[PDB]
Design a protein around this ligand. Structure first.
Ligand SMILES: CC1=CN2CCS(=O)(=O)N=C2C(c2ccc(OC3CCCCC3)cc2)=N1
Ligand SMILES: N[C@@H](CCC(=O)O)C(=O)O
Ligand SMILES: N[C@@H](CCC(=O)O)C(=O)O
Ligand SMILES: [Zn+2]
Lengths: 261, 262
């Protein structure tokens, strides 16, 4: 018997954003963005009503090494606080062991954001110097990439980042971007290419993406194990891709948005 | 029950699976080499099974006959129980995911255009707006189905042309498509996946290239029949191999490291 599906998501541009007039709107209407549009399409194809909820702790999801407790959107699924996560949530092994992911709806890789003119072209460049600090988001997949890497350059970078003072890590993507912008070239931020490429086309047009991506992976829609939504959501992602809807939404929220010419 | 050798279906498609030069003097899995040969050994090791590589009997990827509803190719081998797993450049598609399971993707790709160098085409729109240069796809597979099913104006126009073009613009194998580009003096362009296009661009005689952006974005996945006991282990193994950098290493090994075009 049909119940409203609780969707957990995260305020992250341009995936989910508060509309300019949000104070006078209610419920799902408060929000706009790629994942807001994706949620409406998935719900229509799968035949469910839903409520968008912003993850309580503002995090993507990681497992505490000591307590083994998951936080973020992953934790909301694991502990039964939400039915589905529709967000830029990276498909990773440690997550797929505890939740299920749809096929990917978007490709990405880890990338470098600099303030324009910063003399860095690559991860190797960052690793060979100390004047420019660099770091990642907490409680996400990029931090874990570095923590786990056995590649020489990335291992060196992790050894630096994990002990750097003051802390190079940030609580949100927006904090990382602000830190690049205010640091006069002395901070570079490691973040997913999707977010990097969005910000490069927003005023004040003072950042850019440098070097190749460090890896290749995808975002997926996540459900708790045993969910009755799993198969329908997976097939709906593939239907949306084949209809060209995912490519339409990417153009709508990245390039049609562009403010830097 | 007792542990049983897993039958792997795959397809002779360079550089995924190729006969070794000395294959007549080798046995079993040792007869073959390529990206998917290396990936199968790793999937089997991570999942703890023994396996036998077999080449798909009909040489096809997989499509459902509209009239008989029978699946051919590697998809049919899984559907009908002739193989336990497909480890091949098999595109994840909705109609296939309805009848088999796919792992998470191990390789990204999109449909792309191969030209003979110097052909005056930069895009799908360019192909659609002219008639001097013919163009086609593999005669069975996901690229043909993309065109057949598209509602996008440029692609619909291309399909309307391709489906009625005589003599046939379709080809039986990738190698046939590539040969047709090479011998056609610029008057044939081939629509094929970016992975295969980028491989051939780095092979002698270095006379083709990939032009324009990809027309779509998708992936290849390892496929199992529904209800397979291998499903979860294979899926987690794909994710582990990507995170440990093995997939990017294998792509470099079979595409670029011994590329022949400098
Ligand atoms: C936009 C889009 C749509 N679709 C449709 C569903 S798909 O499953 O066919 N894939 C995709 C896709 C995609 C995303 C990520 C990805 O990661 C791979 C990359 C190589 C190494 C391992 C991880 C592969 C493909 N992107
Ligand atoms: N998409 C990431 C968050 C962003 C990042 O770690 O750079 C995740 O799912 O954890
Ligand atoms: N990978 C495709 C075959 C090649 C193509 O259609 O271009 C499939 O699985 O059908
Ligand atoms: Zn739709």
């Amino acid at each position: 018997s049909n119940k409203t599906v609780v969707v957990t998501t995260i305020l992250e541009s341009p995936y989910v954003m508060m509309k300019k007039n949000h104070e006078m709107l209610e419920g799902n209407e408060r929000y706009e963005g790629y994942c807001v549009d994706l949620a409406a399409e998935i719900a229509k194809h799968c035949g469910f009503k839903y409520k968008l909820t912003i993850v309580g702790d503002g995090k993507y999801g990681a497992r505490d090494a000591d307590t083994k407790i998951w936080n973020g959107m992953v934790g909301e699924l694991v502990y039964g606080k939400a039915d589905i996560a529709i967000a830029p949530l990276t498909i990773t092994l440690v997550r797929e062991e505890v939740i299920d992911f749809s096929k990917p709806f978007m490709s990405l890789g880890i990338s470098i954001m600099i303030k324009k003119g910063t003399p860095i072209e690559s991860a190797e460049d960052l690793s060979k110097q100390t004047e420019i600090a660099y770091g990642t988001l907490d409680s996400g997949s990029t931090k874990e990439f570095f923590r786990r890497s056995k590649i020489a350059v990335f291992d060196k970078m992790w050894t630096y980042m994990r002990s750097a003072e003051p802390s190079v890590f940030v609580r949100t993507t927006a904090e990382g971007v602000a830190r690049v912008r205010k640091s006069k070239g002395k901070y570079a931020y490691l973040l997913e290419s999707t977010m990097n490429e969005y910000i490069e086309q927003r005023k004040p047009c003072d950042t850019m993406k440098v070097g190749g991506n460090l890896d290749s992976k995808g975002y997926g829609i996540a459900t708790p194990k045993g969910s009755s939504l799993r198969n329908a959501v997976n097939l709906a992602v593939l239907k949306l891709n084949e209809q060209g809807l995912l490519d339409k939404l990417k153009n709508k929220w990245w390039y049609d948005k562009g403010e830097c010419g």
